[PDB]
Amino acid sequence: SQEKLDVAGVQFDAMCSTFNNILSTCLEKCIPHEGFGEPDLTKGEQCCIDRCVAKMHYSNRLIGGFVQTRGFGPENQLRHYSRF
Amino acid sequence: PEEQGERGAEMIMNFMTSCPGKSVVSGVTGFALGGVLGLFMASKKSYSSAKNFGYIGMIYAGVECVIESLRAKNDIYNGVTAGFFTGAGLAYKAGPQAALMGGAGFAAFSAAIDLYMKSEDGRPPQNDF
Amino acid sequence: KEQQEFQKVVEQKQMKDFMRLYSNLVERCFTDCVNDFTTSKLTNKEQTCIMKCSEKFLKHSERVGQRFQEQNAA
Amino acid sequence: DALNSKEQQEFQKVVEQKQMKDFMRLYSNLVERCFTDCVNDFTTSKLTNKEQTCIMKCSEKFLKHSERVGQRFQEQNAAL
Amino acid sequence: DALNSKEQQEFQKVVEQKQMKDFMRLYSNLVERCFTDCVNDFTTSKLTNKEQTCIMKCSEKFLKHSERVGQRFQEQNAAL
């Protein structure tokens, strides 16, 4: 079944985009931009990455719930696609 | 058959890393280093020196690893409180002002040590002049 | 005549751009007001801040889409 | 997704293809981040020793950060 | 990479298509850059002549910058 296959493919893409967003944001937030003391990241960065991915996954769940309440979709937001 | 083995490997990683291990490995390290320095101290004395240096190492690494599991950071203002509470908890048995001065001196010593070990990985500058 | 596969790739580009817009929304609304990572669970203040940010970005995107439509039609 | 059968074998190959694409994108972002952080000495035209230690530390810290966020994302999606 | 000698021409066609698509992407990125860099005032609906000149300086500086970096890119990728 091709249709269920690429339905699972776009679902995995929706997982992958969220995962890359979590990874880039928790990279930016509390890995220090100045300097690195060592490889094999320390205790503080481990704890901050755990708390960042917890806060970030809960925030992604909350916003993905809220934009369905406010009706945000491709038809309601992407007005510029109606020209084509 | 392997579930308890992999859980034991994960538990020994957690016990060697996530601050219980941090507290006791530096404690026995300070104990062995105090037993080494007791050869120069006696030249019960070596036992008291080993107890003192094991206390110093254990409470410094424990307060550091519990401040750093807090605060979500990996910067300075860590050692200037870890050594402060180390000096307080060590020279606590005699005098409040003496505990304050001992904590302040140990905080300045830990800050100097962290500024020596830290001002080499700070940032590659715009010029090596 | 060739517009069916063209509208298929328009729909695919639409889905990709919608996912990118949603990810940029979540990225901005996170990165703006979660700046203290001592706790591991969101406070009431940061949760209200995130809901305010998502509402503001949604109506801001609608406003920008309206003005973009009226300056693209002209 | 949920319905897995004999057809999931090609799905895992497509997942491997997408994982190769995502690792190439992650490698490019890794090079960009490690160049942005501490390769900021522009007198010479070759990497000095401090920038080499920077690039090693930034690369290993970035890979440990990526695998940490991957396993914690799995542990957070498992709970829900 | 390495393929048939007759297929180099269609390869050059898709190289040209990639070049014009990247050219339009560079155009949009330049518009974003000196919209970001030089237009901080938001009291009018028209551009100040000072911010006009800047959009002049950004356009020339980023395009000469892009051509210099493209030449050095061809020079550096000639070796490797």
Place this chain on the structure above:
Amino acid sequence: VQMFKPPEFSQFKDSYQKDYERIAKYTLIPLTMVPFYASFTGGVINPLLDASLSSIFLIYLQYGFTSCIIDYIPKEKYPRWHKLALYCLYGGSMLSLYGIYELETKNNGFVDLVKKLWN
């Protein structure tokens, strides 16, 4: 005819428990106003202040419990339960430090717990 003293507690003889208890009291007095001031205006409070407040509260409560336990269970008389209850005070202090640390990170703070119990 006299302005004798603040009412003294059973301070330990060799230790400087009176002075450290005074220090914990005098720094705990203005520190408790900070959640009251920051809670009156809005819902804003930050950790490392709830943690320090609960830790100073713990040190002060441990001093109060040692003073009441020396006052009521003597050292010279009935000393068998006394060392065991001192050890249970220290075990409760350690388990409560771990509870404070689990309340600051995995939860939203002890002052937030107090407010969610009052609400």
Place this chain on the structure above:
Amino acid sequence: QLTWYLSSLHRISLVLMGLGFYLFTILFGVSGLLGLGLTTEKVSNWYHQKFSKITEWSIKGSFAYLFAIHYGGAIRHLIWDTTLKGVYRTGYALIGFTAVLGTYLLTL
């Protein structure tokens, strides 16, 4: 006498607030060495479900009245900074400040 009254009130407020603080801290202490997972939300939900209104109000009134006794500990610090007209004035100011602070904390 007033000194026995204030010292006994200080002692009983200290020990009851000590049991409350120690219990609420080591509830989260024993959840971390084990795998219990007790949040503030779960404990607050259980406390608001299993307890009725009037017992909650009595607990809140007791705790808010006894916290003003430790601000009376700040008052006995104020006498510790340096007579019967002094100590009776501090006792009357103690009980009045305790009453108005318990009212203000019950209004919260």
Place this chain on the structure above:
Amino acid sequence: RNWMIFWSVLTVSIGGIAYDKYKQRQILSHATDLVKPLAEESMEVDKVPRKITVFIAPPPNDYLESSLKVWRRYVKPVLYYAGLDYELVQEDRQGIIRTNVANRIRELRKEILASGVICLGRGAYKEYIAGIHEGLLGPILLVIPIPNIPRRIHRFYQKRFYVEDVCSSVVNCVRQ
């Protein structure tokens, strides 16, 4: 009087050290004087700037890092400002500068028959002029700054004239 004369000799030693390093920082004003001709328009694709090859030899029987110190701290801002794309040819043994320049001239001669310079040190200039006389005659602008037990302290205190000499020679090389 003991602690008085102790802190007196300590503060005059530290005052001399701070005065020498402050004057070394003061010569960076004339480095900024060389930053003034930097702001000139280079072209896009054609113009690659004027290359100043620099030959580095260590002082005799000790390490390369002394000549690298006198290279970096004093000469390299001057060549980094005014946009002069330098190149560094350093040696650890003897003769590598000589065989480098001689192999360069020999490769130019072999290629044609197939059909400024700032060297630091008396040894580097010796090997460079030997490489020139070997490449031009044999078979198939110059600027010479000079790098250098209580004499070490006397040089370490009389340092401002040395960095004035090196910076004045290299600004004469860059400006002219």
Place this chain on the structure above:
Amino acid sequence: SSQQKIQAAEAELDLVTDMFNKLVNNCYKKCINTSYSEGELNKNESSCLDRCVAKYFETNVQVGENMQKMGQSF
């Protein structure tokens, strides 16, 4: 041919899509206050957004004229 017309039809929407995305991102950077106090835009923000999209289209046409000026037509 078919690939030529589908490439032109792809580019004519890729340009407007990337312009909309960069418009939303840059106008959210420039105008919107990061300190969220309410979920709706103020009367100042609603005007500065219109000035933002207007100034963005002016920058687009000026950069187009400047790239036609010194850049060759090829």
Place this chain on the structure above:
Amino acid sequence: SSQQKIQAAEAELDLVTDMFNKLVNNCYKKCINTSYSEGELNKNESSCLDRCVAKYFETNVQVGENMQKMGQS
């Protein structure tokens, strides 16, 4: 086949293209100033860009070796 070879070449092409885009953006951020004073390419920046593309290629080579040290690609 021809389509497979063309896609295998196109992957290399747009890989090199996005490398070039990130290169342009980073070396613009590094020492090319944001305060546009004169409409020129300065003599400092014209060597900045040479050293910047050289250092970026050495950075990409070094990270490509550090990936291949470990068991990955």
